[PDB]
Amino acid sequence: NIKSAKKRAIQSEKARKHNASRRSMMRTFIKKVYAAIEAGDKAAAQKAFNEMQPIVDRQAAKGLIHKNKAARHKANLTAQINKLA
Amino acid sequence: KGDVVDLPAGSTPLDFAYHIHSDVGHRCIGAKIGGRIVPFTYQLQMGDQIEIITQKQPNPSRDWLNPNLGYVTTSRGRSKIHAWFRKQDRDKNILAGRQILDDELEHLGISLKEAEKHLLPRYNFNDVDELLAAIGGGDIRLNQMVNFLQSQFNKPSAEEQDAAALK
Amino acid sequence: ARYLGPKLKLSRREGTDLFLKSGVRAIDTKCKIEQAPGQHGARKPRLSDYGVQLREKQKVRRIYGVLERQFRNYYKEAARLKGNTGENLLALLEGRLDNVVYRMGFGATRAEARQLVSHKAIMVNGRVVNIASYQVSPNDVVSIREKAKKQSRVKAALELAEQREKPTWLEVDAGKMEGTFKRKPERSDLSADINEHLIVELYSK
RNA sequence: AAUUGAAGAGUUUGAUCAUGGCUCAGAUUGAACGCUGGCGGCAGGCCUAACACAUGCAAGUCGAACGGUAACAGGAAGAAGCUUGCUUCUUUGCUGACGAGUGGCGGACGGGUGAGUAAUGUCUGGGAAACUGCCUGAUGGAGGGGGAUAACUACUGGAAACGGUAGCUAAUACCGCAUAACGUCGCAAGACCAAAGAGGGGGACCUUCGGGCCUCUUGCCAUCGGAUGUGCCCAGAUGGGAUUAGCUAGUAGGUGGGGUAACGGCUCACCUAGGCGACGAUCCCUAGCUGGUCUGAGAGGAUGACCAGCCACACUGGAACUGAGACACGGUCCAGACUCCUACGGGAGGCAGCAGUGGGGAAUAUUGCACAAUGGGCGCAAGCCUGAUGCAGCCAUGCCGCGUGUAUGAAGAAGGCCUUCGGGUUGUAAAGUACUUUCAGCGGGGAGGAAGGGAGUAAAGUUAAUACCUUUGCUCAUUGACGUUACCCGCAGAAGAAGCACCGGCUAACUCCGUGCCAGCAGCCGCGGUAAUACGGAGGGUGCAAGCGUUAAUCGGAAUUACUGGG
RNA sequence: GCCCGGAUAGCUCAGUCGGUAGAGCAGGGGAUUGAAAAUCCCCGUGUCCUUGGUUCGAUUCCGAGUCCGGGCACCA
């Protein structure tokens, strides 16, 4: 409903776009990782991770993802690569 | 609308809409004298302009309040209100009436159409549903119906018994 | 509240007296008490036990002129209290401020005592009070509030107190228009013609 | 010193004891109605339609985050107006502060309703795989840059709603790079991520003279905990139905990936074929739960409205979004129904927030007052918002309190009433005489709820500093919706104030006349057919009392579901 | 709002073609029994909406006004 307080809504969209973009970007690198993982070539895979790391934790610190989760990916993933690499 | 109108003193605005029109009164639900809202119960005075809010048609407004002399006084539109409730039940009554009519119409006089012939020119027919409505409303003696229907007047044969009734 | 009917009529019913007709025309009699409380009052119905007990309670209430409700409250109050609830009740009704006024004899009836109360004539300790029901605690000093003191009615009143009894548990000052309720009246003291226990069971039902 | 509590009656029979149902005596209520009605204080007040809703208000705030200033008032200019030096008017954010905007905090609280839910709920007690804004303790950090965008210009779509296009600009908005550890991942070795300043005052110096610099304050970032709140798990408890007996295939379990803050069929893949169920599975009806409320001596039974926790829902069904937190009551979007605008192309709306209206109903009120007090949100603070709240209006709706008078008064008046017609009675009752004066009434006086905050000044902390500032005193000017306040004072005057049920048994309490199985009464037994204590009326009484009765429902009595405590 | 018609003893209800209001209901009473049943015998019963005018006859002509059921004028 209309109120000056409703401004929240629009400002929220002014966030979602930016916010959603970041999420996709994050997932994007992760895709690469799994892709490289499925590719079965540990060198390129390891590297894929080597760059997927800074960004995901950065998102965590940015507050986008509850830090713990970023770590969850990092951990299970490292488990994946070490499982193969 | 800035228009002005006489009113019986103290009549509720619920009555008012009817002075504007019956139908607007059935759909009447709101009124805001001086902009400020007030119930139907507010009796009018000092010729105050009266804002009126309405709706569609379905009502029985003060028809849910007619029995207490509470809300919507007078009798003009008041009676008109009863009329609406009535036309509804009238149609219902008509159907039921139709049934009972056939009953008498065939049980005694015979042939329902001939009974209409024993109705078309008997009591203020106008329509015929008019003749088919009264049957359930008790609006027609609920006895003479047999008497009109029994319009036959042979006579002499009765004298043979009138001579016997005198015996 | 306050029955305010023919004050004496009740004595005619209960077969006793509420002393409402204090000393001047003196002994009631001039009333034809008991003879016929109402119409065919000469009759003396069997009065089934529910009736004798009902009559008992009525009798008491009438005495202090207390209403059935407030009276019941007193009853219940007496119930939770330690001691044979029976007499505890009397400990409650005697503590009645107005009744104390009758005991202190500043009034002559209970009704008079109320009028004194309602009209603020009696301050207690260091305060005027209008609640006739103001329960009066032990060692409670109380007197007529001098602004209305010396109304001749109280003069004649104390004079009538001589021919009354002079309850012992209380500490009337008389001369200086004062009274001090000591310890709560013991059952053995007052009237005793009533069998309060009767009222006790009266609420058993 | 922390329960002392437990009554029975009528009713089957010619009569009796049984047995044994029906009914009654109490208490109880969010009550309603009928009658009646004076005041006060205190609580209570839509239980049906979780039906629809006009208006208002119900959530905003910070200029001490920011570019700005449309407005309100001061300063820099001049002309002029003309009390010719006396004022009026014309440009700029410079200040005071301040619309719209950017932005941070709030909007997830507080408030409402009980539909759904018989268990993803609650209560109880446990447990481990968690998270947690504001607040607080500790440890450190807080450098260096960049790209924007609204605003706001200009043009522009549309009836409107609501937009569109091209350029303009800032920040605690945003994004890099550096930088990180008792942080994260990892066995480790190693990799990686943080941010923001703002304000106040000020000596010296610096002075591009916009400031640097110094000190103070607060904000900002990471980690560690604490408190708090939130999520989750198990056992036990948590209505009725068996004329519901079987149910179940993400179902039960595993392994692995995925998943969320976290465990997990939370989800997928594959594997095992289990899992629940007579100590009721599943299905059916119904219900928000508890603390408690009611009744009862208790054990029980009934219930769970107010106050309080919890939970659920917020026009209906659904999904997410921002955010610490919602799948969000006055946020978004979709669909649906329904109201409303419409230039018909297309939009808008959600009182189960407080009031209020229509409707429903037996039935439940004011479209009020103040943020003074408490708390809450913002903000350094002053403050601002506050239908939470504090109040006032409304209604006998319940609880309690008080008043409607007191004393005296024999001619035992009159009048009504009954009479065995003598009298009794109504009835000290009234009158009369005498006194008081609650609340009423009018008129005076006059609290408390008030604590703070402000202004000042002094001292101490403070640092370069008798500055700013923090704290602490002390002075002064102030903060009350209720509100002709509570209470106290005075004046006048019995003055303004008593009704309702019953009166055969149950059950307190009588007669007379009216009527004649009619009219009628009834909770049960039953009354009434000419001599009614029962019906109607009069009288008198009985009970209760601004209340009294009836209906309503619950326990009671009922040891007629019996554990206590029967057969 | 215009206007329109239907308005009966105590009930249901005849007649209401300008002319002395009465039929069925029970009813109450009679006779029976303590009362009924059974049963015999009798009919009691009004302001035709109340009321004015044109009428010798108005309850059948024309009004007030109310009532009851209508059709429409009745939207600010």
Domain spans, chain C = 7-93+190-204, 94-180
B139/B129 Cα distance (integer angstroms): 13
Shortest-distance nucleotide from B8 CA to C1': E1
The answer to whether B132 and B98 have CB atoms below 8 angstroms apart is yes
Q: Which chains touch C (3 or more CB pairs under 8 A)?
A: none
Q: What is the DSSP string of chain C?
A: ----S-TTHHHHHHTS----S-SSS-STTTT-TTT-SSSSTT------HHHHHHHHHHHHHHHHT--HHHHHHHHHHHHHSSS-HHHHHHHHHHT-HHHHHHHTTSSSSSHHHHHHHHTT-EEETTEE---TT----TTEEEEE-TTT---HHHHHHHHHHTTT---SSEEE--TTSEEEE-SPPPTTSS--SS-THHHHHHTT-
Measured to protein CB atoms, the chain D nucleotides within 7 Å are 3-7, 25-26, 54-55, 59-61, 100-104, 106-107, 130-132, 162, 174-176, 180, 183-186, 191-195, 221-223, 257-262, 321-324, 328, 330-332, 339-340, 349-350, 356-361, 367, 400-410, 412, 424-430, 435-438, 488-490, 494, 498, 506-511, 539-546
B113/B126 Cα distance (integer angstroms): 16
What is C7-93+190-204's CATH topology? Answer: Ribosomal Protein S4 Delta 41; Chain A, domain 1 (1.10.1050)
Identify the sign of the CA torsion C81, C86, C89, C94. Answer: negative
B107/C9 Cα distance (integer angstroms): 77
Closest protein residue to D359 (Cα–C1'): B61
Cβ of B26 near strand E (distance < 7 A): no
Resolution given for this structure, in angstroms: 4.1
Q: Which amino acid is at C84?
A: N
Task: Count Cβ atoms below 10 Å from residue C82 Cβ, excluding itself.
Answer: 6
C187/C198 Cα distance (integer angstroms): 14
Query: CA-CA-CA-CA torsion for A19, A21, A24, A30, nearest 10 degrees?
Result: -90
The answer to whether C60 and C87 have CB atoms below 8 angstroms apart is no
Q: What is the DSSP string of A32-57?
A: HHHHHHHHT-HHHHHHHHHHHHHHHH
What is C94-180's CATH topology? Answer: 3.10.290
CA C84-C90-C91 angle, to 5 degrees, is 80
User: Which distant-in-sequence residues (6+ apart) come within 8 Å of A78 by Cβ?
Assistant: A49
If phi over 0 gives left and psi between -120 and 50 gives alpha, with beta otherwise, what is residue C177?
left
C81/C100 Cα distance (integer angstroms): 21
The answer to whether C179 and C170 have CB atoms below 8 angstroms apart is yes
The answer to whether C169 and C185 have CB atoms below 8 angstroms apart is yes
User: Which distant-in-sequence residues (6+ apart) come within 8 Å of B33 by Cβ?
Assistant: B13, B42, B44, B48, B49, B50, B51
Q: Look at residues C11, C68, C82 and name the one whose alpha carbon lies nearest to residue C199.
A: C68
Helix (H, G, I), strand (E, B) or coil at B51: strand
The answer to whether B57 and B27 have CB atoms below 8 angstroms apart is yes
Residues 40-99 of B with CB under 7 A from strand E: 52, 75-76, 79, 82-83, 86-87, 90
